[PDB]
Ligand binder design. Structure first.
Ligand SMILES: *[C@@H]1O[C@H](CO)[C@@H](O[C@@H]2O[C@H](CO)[C@@H](O)[C@H](O)[C@H]2NC(C)=O)[C@H](O)[C@H]1NC(C)=O
Ligand SMILES: *[C@@H]1O[C@H](CO)[C@@H](O)[C@H](O)[C@H]1NC(C)=O
Ligand SMILES: *[C@@H]1O[C@H](CO)[C@@H](O)[C@H](O)[C@H]1NC(C)=O
Ligand SMILES: *[C@@H]1O[C@H](CO)[C@@H](O)[C@H](O)[C@H]1NC(C)=O
Ligand SMILES: *[C@@H]1O[C@H](CO)[C@@H](O)[C@H](O)[C@H]1NC(C)=O
Ligand SMILES: *[C@@H]1O[C@H](CO)[C@@H](O)[C@H](O)[C@H]1NC(C)=O
Ligand SMILES: *[C@@H]1O[C@H](CO)[C@@H](O)[C@H](O)[C@H]1NC(C)=O
Ligand SMILES: *[C@@H]1O[C@H](CO)[C@@H](O)[C@H](O)[C@H]1NC(C)=O
Ligand SMILES: *[C@@H]1O[C@H](CO)[C@@H](O)[C@H](O)[C@H]1NC(C)=O
Ligand SMILES: *[C@@H]1O[C@H](CO)[C@@H](O)[C@H](O)[C@H]1NC(C)=O
Ligand SMILES: *[C@@H]1O[C@H](CO)[C@@H](O)[C@H](O)[C@H]1NC(C)=O
Lengths: 426, 184, 185
């Protein structure tokens, strides 16, 4: 390759889902004491269900803490966002704006609709309404509530801003021990050396690399603003949780083989002995519905926990360091990554090196000079047609073949495809 | 869901509203809180239903007015405890209610005086997850001990007592960025 | 233990029958009347067993994921040295030692944590005789008067020679270059 492209791509990962709690006596029986007394004879079904749901709710906050709270040093956002030409202004919070999030985070938080707005509902909103019964009010009236997450969106945004500021000021050092400051051009030169390109390529093309980075960030802005369904996974998580809660609410209108789905009709129309059979049928059906909901929620919590473990691994290995793993943090050679807070998830902005504009060259495995075989130390032997040079693999920088660029192993009679040439000696 | 033509010889009772009571309207029994309703209902029909078949409204047979039916203690209530063998004091979180609406939401006039202690007090403040009663809001920031939610945590002591605080994300730090200095 | 104890305590539930004891139902009722109550108890106990098996399967999946992670850590940190950041402890990983634990494994991660940092004046490259010299492995540092080259994670200042650096081009395009002398053996 003779050129390169600085590519910034997004990876959207779910981290947590909504924490839900269920009151059995409100769901199965409501307010009737006969059903509560009959439900007392079913043992510890609901202690088990509440224990499982409480474990899920605790695990959600554990997932958020494991993803976003890896570093406990809240580094201050720098006053000057430009670091050697790299703009960094759209991934860091704006001091002139009332929101503590960044521009990209503000775009991301407006992309997830969040139709399941439990908290927006308070006491007095479900009562005195001019008809127009809501599904959230039906959830609250039947003992289904949504608990808020421990970390608010502002604190997650503060964690993300601290991570980005630490990456901009200290680079890879603050993920291991104390934050050691370094100019950003030298940090990018070290990352270029990490991907296999000598630092002179970064230093001689610093303005072009910074311009490509800024253009890629702007393209990320336009892709988030214009193209819909970018945050598909978080929207699917929200829709799945809301639809599961709505199904649990709508299952209360089933008879389950009883004369009616209304407990009050059964109680008021029949005496005790005849009503116990129908109430037991309704209790069995509603307990089956609750157990089914808890089982699906546990499976979804396991999937969300796996996604959050992967997100925490990516935060450790790509934000706090440079990854040599292929395709782990974007297509191409990974340079650096920036987290962005998202509703119930994290968005990673992966900065990668993509070589381009390749050129054909005639190559040889080794050079036979004075009966000795010379092998390149770091790079390949290339020929432009008349003269033989040595250059690095990922960038065409032809150099004079000297005794310092190569090393001698043996004679030029065993290597297949060797080419006779001269090795310079200073 | 039609007007009653043939009824039993049951004697009526005066209406009790804004209280958790048992009710019996046209043979349709239940338990809940009765409140004045602004609902408009089509004629020759008596009770309103839900998508979960919950009777939320009912037309009175004598005053011909619709009344809401609200279940008793429909809001979520959480109790924060430092633990047995540590203390007996508790803090109560009434989820998604305002602090001035706590006695109305939990029906504090029908509770025991021990429960009526936690219905109001000087140690009340909105925590964005509801109203917390029984814990004082300190201005310090500590690590989380008991997660209330929405950035609020609680702990015992700081005479030991339950305090509530905004959780601390970590130690505040600053890196002096320069374009020509490095730290080795 | 809690799941097993809950499964044991679930046997005292009637599940809508006249009693939770099978012997009372059998001894108090004839066959036809007892089949209904025994079927109710059978349905309830089968539901309890199915619930226990479902929770055990989910917990087994979680334990299997944890064991897969533990086996990966055993392969990549005990049998080798890991370059993955924070995979096997905070800091630069040196070596790890497994320790047997009840129903688990405890990894003792030996890591390298650099400390006691010192401020230095640094330059991306050194311009000498119109040529730009870039460091091979390390950075250019200055103690105030003289320019040295040292490794990144440990301060070991060395004389800037032609073997420590390499030449790329002229000292006019690199931003922040510093004029100095490069020693030649
Ligand atoms: C970083 O990029 C942002 C966004 O493109 C630039 O901010 C805009 O700059 C233009 C030109 O001065 C102004 O008209 C806009 O009002 C700015 N928008 C915002 C939201 O600030 C910013 O100038 C770039 N930074 C640098 C250092 O070049
Ligand atoms: C690499 O591509 C950029 C963007 O098109 C262009 O400006 C630059 O001149 C190219 N460099 C070379 C060496 O062709
Ligand atoms: C290299 O040569 C092949 C074979 O002739 C040709 O198809 C290809 O286009 C060439 N590549 C470039 C970059 O010119
Ligand atoms: C190959 O490069 C050498 C050295 O720059 C130059 O003299 C020669 O003309 C080049 N040959 C071709 C075919 O481009
Ligand atoms: C390369 O392949 C060609 C045929 O395409 C063959 O004639 C030649 O001997 C081969 N060279 C080597 C060094 O293997
Ligand atoms: C009796 O019912 C009528 C409607 O039929 C109603 O207007 C009236 O208030 C009720 N009560 C008495 C005491 O008349
Ligand atoms: C309850 O508090 C909220 C803000 O938390 C406010 O918007 C609302 O008006 C309050 N309701 C009443 C009845 O005071
Ligand atoms: C906490 O600080 C605020 C101002 O930030 C002040 O109004 C309040 O009284 C303080 N509370 C305590 C308990 O000191
Ligand atoms: C390096 O310089 C900065 C800015 O003057 C200062 O805050 C910091 O303490 C210094 N670091 C050391 C290790 O002396
Ligand atoms: C820097 O190091 C050189 C070489 O050891 C020494 O001569 C000089 O005095 C040092 N300068 C300062 C300011 O410490
Ligand atoms: C470094 O920044 C200072 C201002 O802090 C500026 O005057 C100076 O020109 C900059 N140097 C380089 C090499 O960019």
């Amino acid at each position: 390759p003779t050129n390169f492209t600085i590519s910034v791509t997004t990876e959207v990962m779910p981290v947590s889902m909504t924490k839900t709690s269920v009151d059995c006596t409100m769901y199965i029986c409501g307010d009737s004491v006969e059903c509560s007394t009959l439900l007392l004879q079913y043992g510890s079904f609901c202690t088990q269900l509440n224990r499982a749901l409480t474990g899920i709710a605790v695990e959600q906050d554990k997932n958020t803490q494991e993803v976003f709270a890896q570093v406990k040093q809240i580094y201050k956002t720098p006053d000057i966002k430009d670091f050697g030409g790299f703009n960094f202004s759209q991934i860091l919070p704006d001091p002139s704006k009332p929101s503590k999030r960044s521009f990209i985070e503000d775009l991301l938080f407006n992309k997830v609709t969040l139709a399941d707005a439990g908290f927006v509902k308070q006491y007095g909103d479900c009562l005195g309404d001019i008809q127009a019964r809501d599904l959230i009010c039906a959830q609250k009236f039947n003992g289904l509530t949504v608990l808020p997450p421990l970390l608010t969106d502002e604190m997650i945004a503060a964690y993300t801003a601290a991570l980005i500021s630490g990456t901009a000021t200290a680079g890879w050092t603050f993920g291991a021990g104390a934050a050691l400051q370094i100019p950003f051009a030298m940090q990018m030169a070290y990352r270029f050396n990490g991907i296999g390109v000598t630092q002179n390529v970064l230093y001689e093309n610093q303005k072009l690399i910074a311009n490509q980075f800024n253009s890629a960030i702007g393209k990320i802005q336009e892709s988030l603003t214009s193209t819909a369904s970018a945050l598909g996974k978080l929207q699917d998580v929200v829709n799945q949780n809301a639809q599961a809660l709505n199904t649990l609410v709508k299952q209360l209108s089933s008879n389950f083989g009883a004369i009616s789905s209304v407990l009050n009709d059964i109680i008021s129309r029949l005496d005790k002995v005849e009503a116990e059979v129908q109430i037991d049928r309704l209790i069995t059906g509603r307990l089956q519905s609750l157990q089914t909901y808890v089982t699906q929620q546990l499976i979804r919590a396991a999937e969300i926990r796996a996604s959050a473990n992967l997100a925490a691994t990516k935060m450790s290995e790509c934000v706090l360091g440079q990854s040599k793993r292929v395709d782990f943090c974007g297509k191409g050679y990974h340079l650096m990554s920036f987290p962005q807070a998202a509703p119930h998830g994290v968005v990673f902005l992966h900065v990668t090196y993509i070589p381009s504009q390749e050129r054909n060259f005639t190559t040889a495995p080794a050079i036979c000079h004075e009966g000795k075989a010379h092998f390149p130390r770091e790079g390949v032997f290339v020929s432009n047609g008349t003269h033989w040079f040595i250059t690095q693999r990922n960038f065409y920088e032809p150099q004079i073949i000297t005794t310092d660029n190569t090393f001698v192993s043996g004679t030029c009679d065993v290597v297949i495809g060797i080419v006779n040439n001269t090795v310079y000696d200073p | 869901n039609a007007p009653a033509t043939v009824c039993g010889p049951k004697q009526s009772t005066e209406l009790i509203k804004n209280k958790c009571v048992n009710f019996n309207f046209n043979g349709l029994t239940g338990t809940g809180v009765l409140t004045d309703s602004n609902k408009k209902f089509q004629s020759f029909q008596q009770f309103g239903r839900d998508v979960s078949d919950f009777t939320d409204s009912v037309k009175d047979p004598k005053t011909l007015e619709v009344l809401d039916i609200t279940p008793c203690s429909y809001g979520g209530v959480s109790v924060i405890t430092p633990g047995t063998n540590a203390s007996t004091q508790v803090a109560v979180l009434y989820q998604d209610v305002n602090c001035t609406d706590v006695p109305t939401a939990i029906h504090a006039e029908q509770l025991t005086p021990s429960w009526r202690v936690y219905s109001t007090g000087t140690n009340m403040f909105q925590t964005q997850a509801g109203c917390l009663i029984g814990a004082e809001h300190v201005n310090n920031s500590y690590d989380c001990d008991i997660p209330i939610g929405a950035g609020i945590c609680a702990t015992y002591h700081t005479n030991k007592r339950i305090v509530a605080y905004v959780m601390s994300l970590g130690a505040e730090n600053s890196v002096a960025y320069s374009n020509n200095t490095i730290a080795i």
